[PDB]
Design a protein around this motif. Structure first.
Motif, PDB file in Angstrom:
ATOM      1  N   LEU B   3     -23.436  25.793  -3.309  1.00 53.37           N
ATOM      2  CA  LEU B   3     -23.851  26.603  -2.172  1.00 53.37           C
ATOM      3  C   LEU B   3     -22.596  27.241  -1.579  1.00 53.37           C
ATOM      4  CD1 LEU B   3     -26.164  23.824  -0.661  1.00 53.37           C
ATOM      5  CD2 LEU B   3     -26.817  25.594  -2.300  1.00 53.37           C
ATOM      6  N   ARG B   4     -22.712  28.288  -0.755  1.00 52.51           N
ATOM      7  CA  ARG B   4     -21.493  28.957  -0.310  1.00 52.51           C
ATOM      8  C   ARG B   4     -20.590  28.060   0.540  1.00 52.51           C
ATOM      9  NH1 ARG B   4     -20.547  33.608   2.643  1.00 52.51           N
ATOM     10  NH2 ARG B   4     -21.674  34.065   4.574  1.00 52.51           N
ATOM     11  N   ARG B   5     -21.197  27.126   1.284  1.00 56.75           N
ATOM     12  CA  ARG B   5     -20.481  26.123   2.056  1.00 56.75           C
ATOM     13  C   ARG B   5     -19.934  24.954   1.224  1.00 56.75           C
ATOM     14  NH1 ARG B   5     -21.322  25.812   8.034  1.00 56.75           N
ATOM     15  NH2 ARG B   5     -20.191  23.858   7.729  1.00 56.75           N
ATOM     16  N   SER B   6     -20.354  24.768  -0.040  1.00 53.31           N
ATOM     17  CA  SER B   6     -19.961  23.582  -0.798  1.00 53.31           C
ATOM     18  C   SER B   6     -18.472  23.615  -1.143  1.00 53.31           C
ATOM     19  CB  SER B   6     -20.876  23.316  -1.977  1.00 53.31           C
ATOM     20  OG  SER B   6     -20.756  24.293  -2.991  1.00 53.31           O
ATOM     21  N   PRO B   7     -17.764  22.460  -1.132  1.00 53.40           N
ATOM     22  CA  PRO B   7     -16.306  22.449  -1.024  1.00 53.40           C
ATOM     23  C   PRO B   7     -15.563  23.149  -2.159  1.00 53.40           C
ATOM     24  CG  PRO B   7     -17.127  20.242  -1.539  1.00 53.40           C
ATOM     25  CD  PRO B   7     -18.324  21.104  -1.209  1.00 53.40           C
ATOM     26  N   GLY B   8     -16.094  23.071  -3.387  1.00 55.03           N
ATOM     27  CA  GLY B   8     -15.518  23.742  -4.543  1.00 55.03           C
ATOM     28  C   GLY B   8     -15.728  25.258  -4.570  1.00 55.03           C
ATOM     29  N   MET B   9     -16.608  25.809  -3.721  1.00 57.55           N
ATOM     30  CA  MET B   9     -16.936  27.228  -3.719  1.00 57.55           C
ATOM     31  C   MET B   9     -16.191  28.019  -2.645  1.00 57.55           C
ATOM     32  SD  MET B   9     -18.696  28.999  -5.844  1.00 57.55           S
ATOM     33  CE  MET B   9     -19.449  28.638  -7.429  1.00 57.55           C
ATOM     34  N   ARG B  10     -15.609  27.356  -1.633  1.00 52.45           N
ATOM     35  CA  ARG B  10     -15.019  28.055  -0.492  1.00 52.45           C
ATOM     36  C   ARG B  10     -14.030  29.145  -0.909  1.00 52.45           C
ATOM     37  NH1 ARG B  10     -17.550  29.254   2.231  1.00 52.45           N
ATOM     38  NH2 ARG B  10     -16.745  29.019   4.335  1.00 52.45           N
ATOM     39  N   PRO B  11     -13.089  28.930  -1.858  1.00 53.33           N
ATOM     40  CA  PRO B  11     -12.164  29.980  -2.274  1.00 53.33           C
ATOM     41  C   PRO B  11     -12.766  31.257  -2.849  1.00 53.33           C
ATOM     42  CG  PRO B  11     -11.331  27.848  -2.940  1.00 53.33           C
ATOM     43  CD  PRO B  11     -12.764  27.657  -2.506  1.00 53.33           C
ATOM     44  N   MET B  12     -14.030  31.232  -3.291  1.00 53.72           N
ATOM     45  CA  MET B  12     -14.729  32.414  -3.775  1.00 53.72           C
ATOM     46  C   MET B  12     -15.418  33.208  -2.665  1.00 53.72           C
ATOM     47  SD  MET B  12     -14.444  33.233  -6.929  1.00 53.72           S
ATOM     48  CE  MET B  12     -12.731  32.946  -6.496  1.00 53.72           C
ATOM     49  N   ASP B  13     -15.607  32.630  -1.484  1.00 52.26           N
ATOM     50  CA  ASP B  13     -16.299  33.321  -0.417  1.00 52.26           C
ATOM     51  C   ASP B  13     -15.346  34.323   0.247  1.00 52.26           C
ATOM     52  OD1 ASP B  13     -17.745  33.977   1.857  1.00 52.26           O
ATOM     53  OD2 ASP B  13     -18.221  31.912   2.405  1.00 52.26           O
ATOM     54  N   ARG B  14     -15.662  35.628   0.203  1.00 54.70           N
ATOM     55  CA  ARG B  14     -14.884  36.651   0.898  1.00 54.70           C
ATOM     56  C   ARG B  14     -14.684  36.297   2.372  1.00 54.70           C
ATOM     57  NH1 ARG B  14     -14.291  41.679  -1.563  1.00 54.70           N
ATOM     58  NH2 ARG B  14     -15.509  41.914  -3.486  1.00 54.70           N
ATOM     59  N   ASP B  15     -15.706  35.689   2.960  1.00 51.14           N
ATOM     60  CA  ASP B  15     -15.748  35.410   4.380  1.00 51.14           C
ATOM     61  C   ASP B  15     -14.784  34.278   4.722  1.00 51.14           C
ATOM     62  OD1 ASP B  15     -17.959  37.118   3.722  1.00 51.14           O
ATOM     63  OD2 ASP B  15     -19.440  35.547   4.157  1.00 51.14           O
ATOM     64  N   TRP B  16     -14.531  33.361   3.788  1.00 51.92           N
ATOM     65  CA  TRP B  16     -13.593  32.270   4.005  1.00 51.92           C
ATOM     66  C   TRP B  16     -12.160  32.800   4.106  1.00 51.92           C
ATOM     67  CZ3 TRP B  16      -9.634  30.179   0.868  1.00 51.92           C
ATOM     68  CH2 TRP B  16      -9.239  28.858   1.107  1.00 51.92           C
ATOM     69  N   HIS B  17     -11.778  33.711   3.208  1.00 55.48           N
ATOM     70  CA  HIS B  17     -10.538  34.465   3.324  1.00 55.48           C
ATOM     71  C   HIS B  17     -10.427  35.259   4.625  1.00 55.48           C
ATOM     72  CE1 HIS B  17      -8.956  33.731  -0.730  1.00 55.48           C
ATOM     73  NE2 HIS B  17     -10.242  33.555  -1.000  1.00 55.48           N
ATOM     74  N   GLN B  18     -11.434  36.080   4.925  1.00 54.02           N
ATOM     75  CA  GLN B  18     -11.403  36.964   6.079  1.00 54.02           C
ATOM     76  C   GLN B  18     -11.313  36.195   7.399  1.00 54.02           C
ATOM     77  OE1 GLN B  18     -11.016  40.144   6.223  1.00 54.02           O
ATOM     78  NE2 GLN B  18     -11.544  40.928   4.190  1.00 54.02           N
TER      79      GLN B  18
END
Lengths: 49, 82
Positions: B3-18
């Motif tokens: 899921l977008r919140r799941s710990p292994g996925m955070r670096p792929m979320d544009r919003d996590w960077h932004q």
């Protein structure tokens, strides 16, 4: 009698305008390097009161 | 499943960077608890962003009370000797 004029940016007096980069101040600055030297001081006489 | 919140996925979320970019730009110190929601600290892993106030432009912009000389709003890291 020699008057010796030196200027780094030309032949003579250099006048530069500037704005202070920070403070809303403008200025103008003049410079010239000058010396004066007798070649032969014997070629000269003062008149005294 | 991820899921977008799941710990292994955070670096792929544009919003996590932004949002980590925002957090660095809006902070004044490494003290996250004062400056951000518990939700933001968790969701954006702000413990791991190098937040310290060094990237906030207001750390460097002058804001004096009286401004006779137009000094306010100047940024020290834009000067000649920086």
């Amino acid at each position: 009698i020699h008057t010796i004029l030196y200027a780094p940016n030309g032949q003579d007096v250099e006048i530069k305008d500037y704005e202070d980069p920070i403070r809303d101040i403008t200025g103008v600055n003049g410079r010239l390097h000058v010396d004066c030297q007798y070649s032969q001081g014997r070629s000269s006489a003062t008149v005294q009161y | 499943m991820q899921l977008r919140r799941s710990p292994g996925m955070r670096p792929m979320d544009r919003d996590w960077h932004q949002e980590r970019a925002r957090a660095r730009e809006q902070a004044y110190s490494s003290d996250l608890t004062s400056q951000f929601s518990e939700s933001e600290i968790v969701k954006y892993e702000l413990d791991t962003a190098q937040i310290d106030g060094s990237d906030n432009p207001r750390t460097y912009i002058w804001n004096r009370t009286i401004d006779l000389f137009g000094m306010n709003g100047t940024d020290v890291r834009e000067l000649r000797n920086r």
